[PDB]
Design a protein around this nucleic acid. Sequence first.
RNA 1: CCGGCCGGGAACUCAAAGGAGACUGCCAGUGAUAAACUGGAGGAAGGUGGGGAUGACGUCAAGUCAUCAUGGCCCUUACGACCAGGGCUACACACGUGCUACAAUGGCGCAUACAAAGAGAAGCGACCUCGCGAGAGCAAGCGGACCUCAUAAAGUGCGUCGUAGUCCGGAUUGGAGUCUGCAACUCGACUCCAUGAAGUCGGAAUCGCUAGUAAUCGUGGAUCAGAAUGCCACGGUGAAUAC
RNA 2: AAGAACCUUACCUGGUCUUGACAUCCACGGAAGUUUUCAGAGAUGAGAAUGUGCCUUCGGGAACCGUGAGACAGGUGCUGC
Lengths: 114, 127, 55, 161, 206, 98, 79, 95, 101
Amino acid sequence: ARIAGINIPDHKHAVIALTSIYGVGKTRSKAILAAAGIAEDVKISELSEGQIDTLRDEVAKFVVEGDLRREISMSIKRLMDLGCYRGLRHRRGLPVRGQRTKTNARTRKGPRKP
Amino acid sequence: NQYYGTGRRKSSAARVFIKPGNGKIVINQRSLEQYFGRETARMVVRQPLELVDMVEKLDLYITVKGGGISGQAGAIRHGITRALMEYDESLRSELRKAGFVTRDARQVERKKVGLRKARRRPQFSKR
Amino acid sequence: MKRQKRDRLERAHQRGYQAGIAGRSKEMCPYQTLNQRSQWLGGWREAMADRVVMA
Amino acid sequence: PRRRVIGQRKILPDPKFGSELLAKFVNILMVDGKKSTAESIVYSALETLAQRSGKSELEAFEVALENVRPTVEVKSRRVGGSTYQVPVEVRPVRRNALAMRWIVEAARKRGDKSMALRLANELSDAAENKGTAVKKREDVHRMAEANKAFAHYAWLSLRSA
Amino acid sequence: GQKVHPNGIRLGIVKPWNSTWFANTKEFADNLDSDFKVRQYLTKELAKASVSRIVIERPAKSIRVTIHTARPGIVIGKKGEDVEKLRKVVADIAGVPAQINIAEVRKPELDAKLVADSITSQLERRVMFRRAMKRAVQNAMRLGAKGIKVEVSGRLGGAEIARTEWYREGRVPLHTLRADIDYNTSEAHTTYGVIGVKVWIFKGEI
Amino acid sequence: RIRIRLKAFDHRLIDQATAEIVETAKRTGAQVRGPIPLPTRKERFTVLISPHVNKDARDQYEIRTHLRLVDIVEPTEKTVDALMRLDLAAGVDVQISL
Amino acid sequence: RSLKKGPFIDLHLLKKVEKAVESGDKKPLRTWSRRSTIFPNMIGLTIAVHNGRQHVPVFVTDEMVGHKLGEFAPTRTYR
Amino acid sequence: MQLNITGNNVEITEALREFVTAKFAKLEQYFDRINQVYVVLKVEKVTHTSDATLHVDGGELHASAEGQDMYAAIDGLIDKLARQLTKHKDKLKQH
Amino acid sequence: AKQSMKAREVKRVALADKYFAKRAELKAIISDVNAASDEDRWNAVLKLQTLPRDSSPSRQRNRCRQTGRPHGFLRKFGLSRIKVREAAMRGEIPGLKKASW
RNA sequence: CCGGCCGGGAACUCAAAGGAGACUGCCAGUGAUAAACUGGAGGAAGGUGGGGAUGACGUCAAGUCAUCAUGGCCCUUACGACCAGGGCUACACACGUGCUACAAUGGCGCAUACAAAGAGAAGCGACCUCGCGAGAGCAAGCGGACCUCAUAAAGUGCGUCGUAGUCCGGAUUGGAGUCUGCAACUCGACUCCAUGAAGUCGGAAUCGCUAGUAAUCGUGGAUCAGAAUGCCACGGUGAAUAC
RNA sequence: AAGAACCUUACCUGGUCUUGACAUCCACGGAAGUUUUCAGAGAUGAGAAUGUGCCUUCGGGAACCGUGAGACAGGUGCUGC
């Protein structure tokens, strides 16, 4: 119950249980078990350590927690350093993709202060 | 010999051929149980064969098409009663009483304009 | 969309009963046919007693 | 309505048991226009009502139902400034449907894992005179019997049957 | 502005269509466009000819304009030359050739287009609209219409407020679908603005 | 072998032009497979009815395309030219197939 | 995230760059083609993208290559 | 009670919105609990007219006042609304 | 509705039929995957800017042909929703009548 | 080659032209012997059978001078005409109409059953290869009861999830793409990987709905190069209640 | 509004045209049309080649294109009171 830095659930099935890693979801999580020879419905208590070490270097291929967080921070901070339109929206907290801003915009905005 | 009743219900039409035979019911070259006989309202095809007797008396070759599950089911329920035409108003006079011969002509209504699904109106509300 | 409720016979009753209770001691707002006037007045006189039993 | 003692239609009986009361009960918790899974909830609940009660299923449901069917029901009326509730007797068609609505709501509460387990336990305590729908039954009888002093004019339940 | 068009509500039942051509969906629009332009063109050109209604048919890459008028002598002109004078300019703006016909009405006091053109022209030359609007009703009813209703609308004598008048006489049942009602509408461009004239003429039941 | 399919807007005019071709193909030759009806196309057009606002006031319309088959089984040379120079009742459109 | 094959430029921007690069680093290039990409032989230039009422100059930097010219010239002004 | 102001051909200035709002608030406080109020200002070449729609627990109630200077129309509309409110209020007291 | 706009529409019809469907080979034949994906293809997507911009079929508006009204059009009829009611109730569009079912 | 697949058949579904049928026609009672009402029979349907179209005289000096037409006024080297770029998509906020949820009557995975209506020629686009996929290449067929869009979905059987912000929810954002069109930056749609917000059923106030209705589930059309959570249609499942 | 990237588009900033983008009347030239270059954001302006029948009245009769004088054209500009 320690891969990629954390991986601590138990009593869960394996392909759902790997998805607490920041960088994996239900497709890459099936790619890990299908690429590491593990059936998808086993539990983390039911894995033996001679499988779990073969899953640690398996998930060491795709980018995980820290490298992905400083990577996405490099992307957003890069755009804000260029000062393009997208990064100009990132510097101000408005929708980047071109959503409606007259009415909703409220996930990127936050709560409503007035 | 062989006797026929048409029967239809809710955009769904049956063709019922009844013969003096065993107690088997065939629907669209399948059996009843493997067509819908554990699905929703399987009783409504054996139901007109309950006020009359059917046990190993008459086998049924039914081809229903169009509509859905209970539309085909009520279609067959009308088709069997229509196919009790050689078994006369001794049986159909006692088969008026429990229904079974009205076509049950309730069709789905058309969507009216301005209304959303023919009665629902788009909520002039004060809040 | 269906047909009238209790075809003025014992609706004529409860009109005479409501009109009996809410004052109207005229007994001079009935129907004019006999089978409805008879129990407009019937509900009226059944409503006088129900006025004595209360305020 | 103002008019129309309406041309009334009947219902289909239940397939697995010879009952139309049971088919009405399926139509009560038939949420969202979907009869088949409500039939699976009802059958799955009467099975464990039989195993958790010993006796048969139709009599299990009916004995479990007659401890929540009511007799008197309040009707809220206002005259002048007051707005008091007046006990009307429930008519025996409305009676069992008003029982089953309380069973089904009290099963939508109470939350266990499954709906057949919730409704099975709720019918079990309805046999036990213990659960929620008997508390609502006794609330209705306490407030109609508490407001019993009103038997009057014409706006409710003419002479007899 | 709340009634159905009483010529259009009964288009399969009583009245015939003004166009009797089949066109598949690739040529239906243009086949209706040139169909429009010969009606605009003939309506503009034959304005003195007292035209009732023109019916366009398209047999086999050709065209036929049947011209319903009251005075076919002004239409054919001297010797019949003006028919060909119309037919060359019809064939230029339609699919060449053209077989135009005339189908005159011998009772022009019962045609709703010609009554409305009559009241239109008389209001253009400034007659009293009760005299014109009433004289149309008289001239239909003493000639054999089972009903008529004329309505004029607008300034109607230079008033600062517009109003309508209408002088029905007899039966004009607008809701009976088998009832034959010739409705038509014309417009009179007076120097105070537009005066709209619409006339219903009820004739029979089948 | 001739597949004559014809479509029009009025049923009481296409059933007139169909009787104007069965009497042809039975007047000369024989073996016609009946006036076969086909399903009617029902193009529906819903338009707004005011020149401005009042969206809910509409006007629904339809045109009807009626179709009929003929199916001449054995053609005669009087029949294939009897189809020619006889194409009247404008409003009916005809197609021959071989 | 569009235009599968080849970047987009106009001929009056491509020929205007290939004219004004071999002719030395010069005056800022007035451009109206906002919709065109930024090629790596445009690095080092002051191009003035038209935003609607200005021609705002932006020095083309190395990171700006995959973007377009209108991306670095805002149109609406807020506060 | 939130007052919504709108104007057909009447440019709603900030001094105009302050006064109308004050008058509406004063009326709302005096007669009944009011949920929402819509105000419409129209100018038709001579007539400065005003419409108001109050949404109150009983329901909608509306009034309209023509004036000379807009302010007069607003005052008339507010007095009319107050009168309507008195009627609705004890119309649903009626003990 | 604005004769300027109406003539602008027929100008775009004229150039849209003049250039493309004759020089649609610059994209429908050249700008493809083949063994010709060199600077002939870049010469093609380079080339379509030289053509008049008002030659593409996607600058058409498909207006009404009695009024030029840009909104509310019918491709079957060629008329806007006002004029097709005006001609439908008159009896112009053949076979068209009011529908009810 | 058990595929309506093939000779064949014209019964049946169906197509869609013509007819028949339902009119208080018959019976019993009530009623001024009247109109009518209540109940019964027969019948597919019984009391204007269900639904639509149809909107009286008028009101609101309601809406439209930006569909059009038109009286008057105003501009006519500009309020007219052409082009590029932008804006119509801005956002402290307020209101209206909707979609998706908050889950176990469910989510997910596998297997599998049943529709009606419609559209299609610079268009709809099989099959077969390549791609995880949006899609790409070749390319038949079809101006269509034939060919294509086009696998209906809810449902059903099996397995798992065990009541948690969870295997709910799918917002936002990053990366990589596809298609359309000269051209997806402002500002398109979609796909893939990742990210995983609010939300645990909504105060005061408020709306629709009486039966194939409500409520849910999918499908199609127009407008359209591309761009529906809207509109207009169609079917599936299908209630409660009216004293 | 039954579907605003351009167009639509009516609004804004700039770049231009004036009997005009669209219609008629008068005169003078030219077949119309077609391939390509330069400049420019494009409109536009400059070109470079190609092209020539319908009736003999023949400077034409057409269709089409340019320049010139106005009568005008045009206006989604105001008034739905």
